[PDB]
Amino acid sequence: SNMVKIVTVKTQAYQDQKPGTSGLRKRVKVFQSSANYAENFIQSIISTVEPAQRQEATLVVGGDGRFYMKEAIQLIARIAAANGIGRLVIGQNGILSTPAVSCIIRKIKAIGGIILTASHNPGGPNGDFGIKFNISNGGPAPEAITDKIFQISKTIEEYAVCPDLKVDLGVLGKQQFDLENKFKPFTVEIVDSVEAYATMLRSIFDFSALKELLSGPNRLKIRIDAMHGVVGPYVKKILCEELGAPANSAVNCVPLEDFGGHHPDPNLTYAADLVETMKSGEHDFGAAFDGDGDRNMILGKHGFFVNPSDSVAVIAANIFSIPYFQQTGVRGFARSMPTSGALDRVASATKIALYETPTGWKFFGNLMDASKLSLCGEESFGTGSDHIREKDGLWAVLAWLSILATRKQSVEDILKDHWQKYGRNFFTRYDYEEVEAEGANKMMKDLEALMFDRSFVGKQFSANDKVYTVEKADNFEYSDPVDGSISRNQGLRLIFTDGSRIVFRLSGTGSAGATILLYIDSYEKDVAKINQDPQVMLAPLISIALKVSQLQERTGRTAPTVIT
Ligand SMILES: [Mg+2]
C-alpha cells in the first residue's frame, strides 16, 4: 500500500465535460452514476501538461468539503501518479479554500491546481459537484486551456491510473508512492489547510492591530458565518485562535458535506440566520462566505447591509489602513460593468484608474498580471486584490476590520460618511429566473435596436420631479488591454446624465431557459436623499427600466424572482 502498479483503463468519452470559467459542475449523481466520468475529466486535464514537464510539476489539490470531494481527490491522486505528475500538495482532509489554492500555487510555483468545489451551489448526495482547474498564476484556467480539455474529453479512449494508490488525507507530511517500473517516485504532501493562507494574511494585514481590535472588554464584537463551508477552519484558526476573537464569533465554521442542507451562498436570505443574529444589536460586525470562500457579505450593527458595490468602494476609500497597500501602493481599481459606480467616485476623487470590465475573472487577472489592478469588486458579493488570482472573502473581512480599527466608527457610520463625501450609488439587482428563452431574447434584441437609434441619446424620462436624460446607450463591449481580445454583447447599458444607469444582461447559466439580470444604479448627492430607503429611491429608474424594455410584455413577469 505504498508500492503501486500503473494500469490503463479503456473508457468511453462523454460529450458534456465542458470546464467553463468556474469549472465543470454536474449533479453529484451524474459523477457517481456515469462510469469513469470523473476519471475521464481528470485525465483530460493532465493530458494538457506536456509529458516532459510532469515529473518536475506540482499540482495543488483541495476543495470545499462537499460530498464526494475526498473520493475525487483520491482518484485525482491515482491518475496524476500514473501519468507521471511528480508531486501533489493536498490540503489536510482535502480541505482548501479557493483563495488558499491560489495562494499555494503562487507560493510554491506549482503548475496549477484542481479545486473540488461548486462554490455557492448546494452540496450533499443530492447536490452538485464541481471540478475547477487553475493554472500556474494561481487563477482559473483561461478559455484556450479549457477548450483543449473539452476537446480531449470528447474523444478520450483510455486513461492511466494506479488503482491501488490510497492517500491518507488526514495526516500531515510527505507520503511517497513507488510506482512499478518507474524510477522517480510520486510524492504527496499533506499541508495544514490554513497555514500558508494565514501566513499570507499575516503579511498583508496588521495582525497586532487586529488582535487589539478583537480582544478585551472594549472589543469589536463580530459574528463570522462560514455557512458550513470551507472558510470555517480559516475563521477559527485566524480570527479566533490567532487574533483572539471569542470562539462564539465563528458561526457555522465546521465544514459539512451537505453545507448543513442549505446553499453556502452569502446574501440576506440564504444567510438570514446571521442577519437575525446581527439584528439583535449585540455585535458590531457580521459577515458570510460562500462554499469555497471567494465571496463575502458584509453586515453592520443591527443588520445594516453593506452592498458589495459599496463595500469595494469603502475599502478603496480607506485602502491605506491595510499594510499591503501602504507598501505596494494602489496600482488601480476595477469593477465589473454591472457593478454600481460607487467605486468610480472614489477612483475619480483619488485619481486612480477605474477599469470597467465584463463579468468574469479573466479581465481582473490580466490587469493584475500587468501591475495595473490593486483592488476589484463585483456586485455579486465579490471583492479581491492582486494578492492572489482568485477573489477572497475572508481577505475582504480582514480589510473591513483593518478599516474599522483605524476609523473607530461603526460600519453604518462609515457608510453614511462615505455617502456624504462621494454621494450614494443606490443599487439593486433584479433576477428574473427561468423566463422563456424566446421572450427574453426578443426583449434584448428589441431594446438594443431601440437604444441604437440616433434619437435615443438625449431622450428624457420623468420620474417625476426628477428627469433622467440618457447620455449613452449601447451593448457593452470591452477590448482587453493585455490579451488583445474583444468581448462583445456584454450587456445593455442605459447611462444617464445624472450618473445613474440601467443595465440588462442575460445570465450565462445552464438553467432551464434564460435568466434576466436587471441592475439599477441611481446616483444621488443630496443630503435629504442619501439616507432614504434604497428600494424607494430606485423605484423611478425601475419603472423606466421595465417600461423601456417591455419586460412584463415580453416575459409575463410582473415581479423579479430575486431582489438583491
Ligand atoms: Mg465561490
User: Which sequence spans correspond to the domains of the chain?
Assistant: 1-200, 201-303, 304-403, 404-555
Spacing, Cα 402 to ligand 1 middle (Å): 23
Separation CA 60–CA 100 (nearest Å):
10
Spacing, Cα 22 to ligand 1 middle (Å): 9
Same fold, 201-303 and 404-555: no
157 DSSP 8-state letter:
-
Nearest Cα to 418, choosing from 503, 499, 283, 318? 318
Q: Are 333 and 345 in contact (CB under 8 A)?
A: no
Query: Would you state the CATH architecture of domain 1-200?
Result: 3-Layer(aba) Sandwich (3.40)
Query: Would you state the CATH architecture of domain 201-303?
Result: 3-Layer(aba) Sandwich (3.40)
Is 445 part of any known ligand binding site?
no
Q: Are 374 and 332 in contact (CB under 8 A)?
A: yes
Q: Which of 119, 153, 336, 500 is catalytic?
A: 119
Distances (CA, A) of 263 to 120, 256, 290, 291: 6, 12, 8, 8
Q: Are 221 and 285 in contact (CB under 8 A)?
A: yes
Sheet with 128-135, strands from edge to edge, namely 3-4, 173-179, 186-191, 87-95, 58-63, 112-116, 128-135, 24-27
Separation CA 200–CA 475 (nearest Å):
40
H/E stretch holding 546 reads helix 534-549
Q: How many CB atoms lie within 10 A of CB 32?
A: 14
Give burial (CB, 10 Å; 0-12/13-18/19+) of 242. middle
Q: Which residues contact 301 (CB under 8 A, 6 or more apart)?
A: 278, 281, 283, 284, 285, 410, 411, 412
Sheet with 222-225, strands from edge to edge, namely 250-251, 222-225, 285-289, 296-300, 305-306
Q: What class is the 404-555 domain? A: alpha beta
Cα Rg, the chain, nearest whole Å: 24
Looking only at Cα atoms, what is the longest distance across the chain? 82
Is 292 part of any known ligand binding site?
yes
Q: Could you confirm whether 33 is annotated as catalytic?
A: no
What are the grid coordinates assigned to 66, written together? Answer: 462537499
Separation CA 506–CA 554 (nearest Å):
14
What are the grid coordinates assigned to 140, written together? Answer: 482559473
What are the grid coordinates assigned to 21, written together? Answer: 470559467
What are the grid coordinates assigned to 71, written together? Answer: 473520493
What are the grid coordinates assigned to 158, written together? Answer: 483510455
Distances (CA, A) of 412 to 193, 408, 424: 34, 12, 13
CA angle 10, 70, 16 (to 5 degrees): 50
Q: Are 307 and 341 in contact (CB under 8 A)?
A: no
Q: Are 129 and 41 in contact (CB under 8 A)?
A: no
Q: Are 494 and 474 in contact (CB under 8 A)?
A: no
Q: Which amino acid is at 538?
A: L
Tell me phi and psi for residue 426, to 5 degrees.
Answer: -60, 140
Separation CA 380–CA 564 (nearest Å):
9
Q: Which fold has domain 304-403?
A: Alpha-D-Glucose-1,6-Bisphosphate; Chain A, domain 3 (3.40.120)
Is 1 part of any known ligand binding site?
no
Separation CA 147–CA 145 (nearest Å):
5
**Distance between alpha carbon 431 and the CA centroid of its chain, in Å?**
18
Q: Which residues contact 54 (CB under 8 A, 6 or more apart)?
A: 46, 83, 84, 85, 86
Query: What residue ranges in 330-448 does DSSP mark as E strands?
Result: 333-336, 354-357, 375-378, 382-385, 424-435
Give burial (CB, 10 Å; 0-12/13-18/19+) of 19. buried
Ion ligand 1: protein residues whose beta carbon lies under 5 Å: 119, 290, 292, 294
**Structure-determination approach:** X-ray
Q: Which residues contact 532 (CB under 8 A, 6 or more apart)?
A: none
Is 413 part of any known ligand binding site?
no
